[PDB]
Amino acid sequence: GSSGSSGPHGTLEVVLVSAKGLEDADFLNNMDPYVQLTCRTQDQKSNVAEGMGTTPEWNETFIFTVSEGTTELKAKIFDKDVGTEDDAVGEATIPLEPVFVEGSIPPTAYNVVKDEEYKGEIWVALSFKPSGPSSG
Length: 136
Prior knowledge:
Elements: E1 9-21, E2 35-38, E3 43-45, E4 57-67, E5 72-77, E6 90-95, H1 97-102, E7 104-114, E8 117-130
Antiparallel strand pairs: 1-4, 1-8, 2-3, 2-5, 5-6, 6-7, 7-8
PDB class: plant protein
Keywords: C2 domain, elicitor-responsive gene, RIKEN Structural Genomics/Proteomics Initiative, rsgi, Structural Genomics, plant protein
Assembly: monomeric
């Protein structure tokens, strides 16, 4: 583990579409799980999937401020009952490397694991917005 290379800088987008589970997985069933993004000591929870099923949607959007260091987004799922810091039904790793290269990433089902076990997949979209020509 060694740093050095430089990174981009600007605004980041996070479209929390939905999250589907496996065929034989009691993930997000009979509950109100919510997603929690994290970008530089900055997280944001989404609406509470009230009785949505194994496919709780949100169709939300979270904008973050990138500034080196951060090259991936953290998405943890829990239960409106529980707390971000208690027990996360699962989690997913959304890298901004593809968004930083492409500048816009569609809503893809990101592998959702929990401690190491594959819970399912989380659909999320990313969109980077580098401070182009403004001051001039």
